[PDB]
């Protein structure tokens with residue numbers, strides 16, 4: 035039951051450095067990142083999946099100094115995913131999405147294809163020119179992906195933790211993201227928790243529905 | 251299996267208005283909204299769950315003008331969730347979260363509780379005072395919740411569609427959100443697709459992982 039999963043998952047505070055994902059699980063986590071939905075199917079994202087110790091070290095540089103509790107989590111875990119957002123929306127990226135939709139056989143005619151591209155241009159241009167929010171709007175889609183991912187990995191029976199506690203500037207420069215047109219937003223170490231994870235046996239806490247939720 | 255679910259879910263273009271959530275399902279979707287994770291467990295969110303004809307109509311007012319093709323989706327679905335973000339953060343909201351954690355028994359001492367509050371203040375204050383990004387940061391958490399929700403509902407065997415195509419100004423005023431300190435971001439009709447959902451029988455399209463994903 036997916037509710038069981040939601041009610042039992044937690045942010046892992048410590049991972050077992052000897053516990054690695056199976057080859058199949060590593061396939062599955064990539065599938066989840068890929069198939070997240072997104073406004074307009076714009077998919078405005080890059081993922082860095084670090085599974086080597088050298089790889090994870092490069093990511094963990096972003097936590098050295100000020101985020102050092104995040105460091106252990108990034109280094110101990112089997113796989114560390116950096117979620118990145120496109121910085122500006124390029125008409126090349128919109129073309130590449132609609133051509134992918136076409137290749138997959140989503141459009142019955144070229145009329146259908148041109149109409150999809152036109153719609154996508156309209157909203158994308160609205161974010162950039164009008165609302166001046168295209169970076170933010172693209173970042174929101176990455177956070178949607180994160181939410182999808184966390185539940186997904188929890189349902190696979192894997193431990194994870196979302197981390198905003200890292201230096202985006204450091205991690206960007208470590209992978210040359212600014213120049214490729216990306217920016218790191220969230221790091222998600224994935225694996226199996228150790229006996230040092232105090233949060234594994236703590237009760238979940240949420241505000242009551244009568245505060246957060248109106249039924250009409 | 252959750253990967254099956256991720257691969258099979260779709261954005262529903264038309265719902266069957268006769269097909270209601272069971273009373274149990276209506277409780278389950280509320281559970282998912284509440285138990286989404288968030289940075290600092292800040293839960294900077296409100297939900298409107300519209301299940302009456304009256305209620306859905308009030309939401310569908312937001313799909314005036316350019317957003318007309320949203321309207322059907324909002325009226326025909328069994329349940330329609332408006333995801334709202336807090337507009338600025340109040341110290342009252344941070345208190346209410348830490349008091350909730352305490353009531354749920356997450357802290358062994360007052361030292362534990364005071365240190366959690368102070369940590370939450372540190373990052374929260376960083377967003378408002380330094381980065382001037384607290385609105386955006388709270389909205390990002392709401393989108394994480396949306397991602398969690400869409401997969402969750404899909405795992406329950408329910409259809410849904412995320413909608414950014416609505417008039418947030420109209421929906422806010424309809425529900426007096428500005429005055430209560432919220433703003434609508436995403437509308438998610440939930441129910442069962444009809445045979446007129448053209449998207450139910452189309453292939454899923456995503457960019458290939460050789461574009462989106464770097465393994466290190």
Ligand SMILES: Cc1cc2nc3c(=O)[nH]c(=O)nc-3n(C[C@H](O)[C@H](O)[C@H](O)COP(=O)(O)O)c2cc1C
Pocket residue numbers: 043044045046047104195196197198199200220233238286287288289290291394
């Ligand atoms: C975007 C995001 C950022 C987070 N950053 C951190 C982090 O830097 N360090 C950490 O220990 N937990 C982090 N968390 C975990 C949260 O504190 C956690 O989701 C929240 O307290 C709810 O608990 P749960 O995830 O165990 O249900 C983050 C959560 C989210 C959603």
Ligand SMILES: Cc1cc2nc3c(=O)[nH]c(=O)nc-3n(C[C@H](O)[C@H](O)[C@H](O)COP(=O)(O)O)c2cc1C
Pocket residue numbers: 070071072073074075178259260261320411412413414415416436449454
């Ligand atoms: C934030 C968000 C906003 C969306 N808004 C709309 C919308 O207003 N109308 C619509 O029909 N679909 C909307 N979509 C659906 C997307 O087009 C869909 O998620 C994407 O094409 C991928 O297809 P799938 O959800 O079937 O996998 C939205 C998706 C997201 C993530």
Ligand SMILES: O=C(O)c1cccnc1
Pocket residue numbers: 072073074075157414415
């Ligand atoms: O994905 C869509 O079709 C979409 C996204 C934003 C606004 N209107 C439509």
Ligand SMILES: O=C(O)c1cccnc1
Pocket residue numbers: 198199288289290291373
């Ligand atoms: O939730 C946390 O633990 C958190 C959030 C932001 C930054 N550092 C920690």
